């Protein structure tokens, strides 16, 4: 899949195209439906499959700092948009263009122009040009004759709108398994392993892995989460009894740094059953379940304790997880007990 | 109108002034009571009327940074007590002097040697000297004979007491109507417009103007409101289509900039019908009613789409408001529609 | 009494002891049990009564910067332990030493090869070893025939469990006097008096005291409290009217610095009928009973006379102390009335 | 003067204008020969004279955080180019437009379809479009028939090079003599007065005026300097013996207080006053001295008095050298 | 000694005094003169000895954040106050009162209402009132014969001139045999013992207690000590082999670490302990070695030990020369 | 490889071992004789070649925040290691064990209980247990027929000394060539790319790649550098004209931007590309220039161009020197 940044960088020999436009956050199953119906159209004509996405997030131009929360960072966008059979991403900064333009001069210079796109495919919701003007109904009748619009409408299933909006409430609330059920697959971050409490390894209170994330990025509430942890395709050592590329059952507690200066959460995986610090990796948390909600502890002894049920929990979500295996990981390490 | 910093640096050939004293923080309805008896007493025998007043507040000595907001700034209270017929203002530092006297040696000091008054005009809560001993009741008693006191009962108006503290209350409920009402006046801010998103002009989502105040200044509470901005008299040029001295309708967004070290309000102006960029001016933001609480915004069209909402209100509001003349701007611009 | 960091600073040649094991925060009712129990068996066969204790709390060792807030610094645990008889304490890192012992090398390791025990005490609620897995009952049967084993049972009263987490809900809430009870004293801190606002004396609005705490200091909630101000011994000058170790009374304000990073109490002295500045000092504040919530005020004369009503309610609160003579200090000073 | 911000702003029924185009940073007097250039060719063609300039500073762009100070703010960039006489200010962010384009497409998008140019002027160093490929010949060969070039040398004066750069220069060892003289005016800046040390009154310690400046500011280096201070226009009441619109002596002390903001100190000679809420204009006129640290109140007092002599004559020079001095001023021969 | 916080805290019914007035700071051999001849006055006329100061610095009134670093803490200012004999110290603040007052009004008040003396002591360089214009002859001529006056001059001893001046030079630079010489002690801070690097104990590299201070507080350069340690009376148990009011040899690194502190970590001879929590004084003998950087475990314990060899010798000097050495001390020959 | 933190991690049942021990920082050419030593004497006993190493750095134990600079990161330290054909890194934690130990015992619990050691390689220099009193010589004495120890001097080549110091000496003042020498290897870090200016594209002034490191990171002082960028094995897409494992020519300039954080910002010679998000190595080959101010977009893009020349040539001598050079290159003659 290619990259590019600015109408400027896409090819000027590119011939023909079908596009879809969006911010795409968290490329929800709505989203998906977008993806389809374009790669679909695409295949069909001989044509490249492209997506016209924003960063930064449009909403942050006008009201910068007061941005929505991203499911996913954009890199992790690219990722899925390649998974799903985008061949090229165009990513657009509205402080660079397209924003005073008006709705005529958008599809000329956008589509046409710049993509030689041949068919668009938009969300009811969809809106561009100047003061918001130009709508779904203004795309169809602005396109009739030079290319043909298909407009999808908003995903709803089980009395529940599937948008990004959504995806975020219920990962504030920490809702986890209907988050999922909204994305159609285990709501994840990735980053590196950096040093926490003591070292993994043969005791059970000290994390098996420690990571940092943004307030920009999107995480549940605070509390204890069942999922999955994987350590990211690598050469290097690895301290322990974990294998890369596997998925590892684990109990994920979510935290916020006190106090700090753009707090600033935190990600603590306890990883069932393996004795393994992951100092210097790129690991994958996903998420499966919520188990309970943050508590101060007042002991030692109280502490591993409220641990053993947190695992308990785990082991019996995690174990009906994999008979739903459309989301779970094709290989997986999760002990029938401890 | 003269300004004294200090009992010092009041001349001493001062021979006669008619004299009234406190905060008067705001100069609300019933400081203008005051300074109404204060200033007519003055004009009967060809005396100067005098305003004493305290700066820091005197509760922020005793407990620092613990003082209550300051509805006006000092500057403010200085022309409003201008505007209301004053002819010197003496400032008093309670660091400096006035605290640890007597109420003998606080009235033949202030009163007698430096202000050299034979009218004394003070609110039936005044208090002086050491511990706050001397009242009201004070002040009569050891003024007989040597110069005449007039004790002037608080305002009630309508039920409510019209006090600093009244006043402070209705501004953190966001009712600006009300305490409009017990000021006599539009409350408003004044300061320097500096950058913020954007460029203002032909895009309704860029504000016209941004300003930041510290967090000793009270301000309505977060939200929305109808109110008229007023490019300060000047000689610089203008961005745009805003003429000085002239009061715009706008629409104006009060806000706490998240998350920030001693936060720390905006002001965020969106003056109806006119593409203008004010970066560089001294702006007067005046406040008439409030329109809606604090929202976060998923969308640009969902954030455009509110937008358009609060200004179809304050043109309803700006309209009423231009009737009730008294606190209305003599020069303004309000369209009747967009 | 002597203090040992870590099991190599013992001497070798210390050739009998009982023992205590605990964190031992407060020292409330129930670990004088422990100790009274771990002195009088020392005192019948002529060995030393030796404390075993942790520092930095075990909480934080495996959950950094969110351990329980310190009811005593490790300083005061030292003299309380000392003032009830023990004859060494030893301290425990668990970030060196004991964390990850099995419980039968625990056993070994401290208490015979270091300490050489004949006698151990220990709470019902203790753990010790690699995951917390040897218990009381664990200890009984380890040391059977090798050295004699005390457990004694947790303490409650008036139907309320006695215990370092019941202590700091009783704090945390403002409930002194329930604390007091608990402890068996009244609840205190000490500390260096620092420059505040103006200086102590004449002036009732002043304190006679400013002090600062860290936010790992448990202090009661926000308000203010009936107690005693004790000037620690001293051959340096005083400023004013008060004399070195004579508990003199005084309205205490609890308060919480704004906004500050790694917020940060302070306490703020008014002692009765004293005119003093204490700047340089180090003071002991006891606490006896609240006396009302925090509030914010608007002027002078409304702050002093709130300021007397305390006065006024201590007064009362302490001549009540003074009479159950068990927790009130040896020498006092309390004035009738003012 | 109207100030458009993007060439999206540009009136579109400008029909016909003289450009000059640069940073003009400081409207300095090189600055100052093309302004005076396109100002008259305009008045010939009947037309009106554009000034087409950049914020954010064009190396801030690719060099964040680490772009030139600026000798004036964009607010007096705007007020100079007016009181040259220009009409119209076009404010190019190059964020937005004009950065990544051809040197072909540059002349034709700015020049023709949004200005409708006639005539241009530049400096001999101007370049333009992607990598910056478009010289100052570039320009020349490009516009051909359809609009007058004019390309005008640097200025060297006393065998001194005028630029920004050198001004830049002489401020930051603090010789403002030098920045004025190329300049063609007494460096200044302008701001509200804030709370400082006491009270200004009848104290020589205390400051008439403090004011504190962000690091993107350029000022003379720490120092103590002749200047004047003046009041500007108000109907708010002046606590003290000064009114606005005087430009009153001063010995001025600038100062840094790290962890960025610098500090200027005003010591109104001969006056009691206290400027606490107004805006005031601050001009540089010579350097007194060095910055030093006192140890008591005598030292520190008895320097500052010799501050005032040698402002006292410094700016009696000023007055009478005419051609920098403003119009209306206040200063006395003694105390 | 009482301590009055401004002049109305003065007893009402104080009816004779001899008075010193001055900034105090550091109370050194030039401070010692002042007070010993104001005390041995005030026995003369039966009357109390009173020490007129000033707090904040005067300095600072002026120029905020820009006073000299203090020499000793105002508390340490009262307790060597206290031990030269002065029965009371008046403190006032110039943001209060005696500021802006004329020359002849200040004595008026302070000396003549407030005070009620009978004999003033001052240095030549004293200077009061408005604007400093009060100066060591104003005090003559204006006192008469209510008040007799005794001017008396700086210290000049071995060449060397003594005052807050030259002392916080020699501090500044390292040289603290020569700060101490012109204090008549071994200067010293005294403060809480806080947690550091590991725990004092068997173990050489660890200290046996740190101390932090406040950017107001003078400190020798940066760089390793001979010195003193004292636990300052107290009931609370110790913590290794160390008793209270004894002064122990120690080696004494005094170091930065900025975003302002300094620090101070006393390595204390042949004695294994743990002060955490105590109050520590501690003395400054003579410099040692620069500050510097290591690489290596061993490299850090090779330079170490030799700090020790040089303190050892160092301090049986100043035990010897006498006249400076504390009453009781613990110092072994060798290891 | 396996890695054990703690003497309580190691497997019980490990009956035979050849054991080196040292803090490792840079497994420079020194190092190397160490492990090859090791590794051949392991072959030998059919045993485990161990790695015993020390985190956090010793120095940092006894001198808190003022510990050498890491030439590599405790990760990077582990896969050189494994590249030299480590079986087992063993990582000694001072705050935790073998710190206040004898001698004697420290021996007998690390090298005996613990490893099981046969034979044992250590560096001329080295040192144990309490205050460091056991040193190359104790453990020769200690050991006697029961392990055979192997004491290897330090190295010395071209009349220069080869440690870890003198490896931070070169970096540190920019000497880039010498520490590569030093270290048999290009010195390189690795990060995550994030944003930074513009985006990597057609703009020659906009980075390919941004990256950030705190101030425990050795650097090369602040300039410019010829070097290679290589984005790490990845199925992520790139944005732009280059595969991952491929060393790409590129122009490194390294910054600072304080209040700590360094910066590096790589110009990828002759490609547009932005790697924003891709895990990238940056290794270092020569000096190019000091850094420097600029005043203009030309100037800097003048620079710029200067840079890429310079580069083109060093990088073409690092090609032909082939001995330190990447397996998989891409670099042209010209543009």
């Known amino acids: 899949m290619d990259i590019w940044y600015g109408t400027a960088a896409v090819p000027k020999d590119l011939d023909n195209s079908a596009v879809t436009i969006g911010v795409f956050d968290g490329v929800h199953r709505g989203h998906q439906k977008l993806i389809n119906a374009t790669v679909e ?48 991403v165009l990513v657009i900064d509205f402080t660079r263009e397209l924003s005073g333009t008006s709705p005529e001069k958008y599809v000329e210079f956008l589509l046409e122009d710049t993509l030689h796109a041949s068919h668009v495919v938009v969300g009811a919701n969809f809106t561009f040009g100047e003061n918001a003007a130009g709508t779904a109904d203004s795309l169809r009748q602005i396109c009739q004759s030079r290319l043909t619009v298909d407009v999808i409408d908003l995903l709803d299933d089980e009395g529940v709108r599937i948008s990004s909006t959504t995806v975020r409430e219920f990962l504030s609330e920490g809702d986890v398994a209907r988050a999922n059920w909204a994305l159609g697959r285990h709501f994840y971050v990735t980053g590196p392993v950096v040093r926490g409490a003591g070292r993994g390894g043969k005791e059970l209170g000290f994390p098996t892995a420690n ?13 204890v989460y069942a999922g999955w942890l994987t350590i990211l395709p690598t050469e290097a050592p690895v301290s322990g009894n974990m294998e890369p590329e596997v998925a590892y059952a684990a109990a994920i507690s979510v935290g916020t740094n006190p106090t700090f200066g753009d707090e600033q959460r935190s990600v603590e995986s306890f990883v069932l059953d393996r004795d393994a610090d992951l100092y210097g990796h790129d690991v994958k948390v996903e998420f499966v379940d919520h188990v309970r909600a943050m508590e101060k502890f007042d002991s030692v002894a109280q502490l591993l304790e409220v641990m053993a049920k947190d695992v308990q ?11 739903a295996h459309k989301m779970a990981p094709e290989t997986y390490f999760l002990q029938a007990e401890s």
Chains 1, 2, 3 share one sequence.
């Open 41 to 88: 159209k695409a295949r069909e004509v001989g044509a490249k499959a492209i997506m016209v996405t924003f960063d930064p997030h449009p909403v942050s131009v006008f009201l910068p700092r007061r941005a929505p929360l991203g499911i996913t960072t954009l890199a992790e966008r690219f990722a899925l948009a390649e998974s799903f059979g985008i061949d090229g």
């Open 313 to 323: 929990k785990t082991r019996t979500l995690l174990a009906q997880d994999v008979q």
């Open 211 to 223: 990571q940092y994330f943004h307030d920009t990025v999107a995480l549940p509430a605070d509390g």
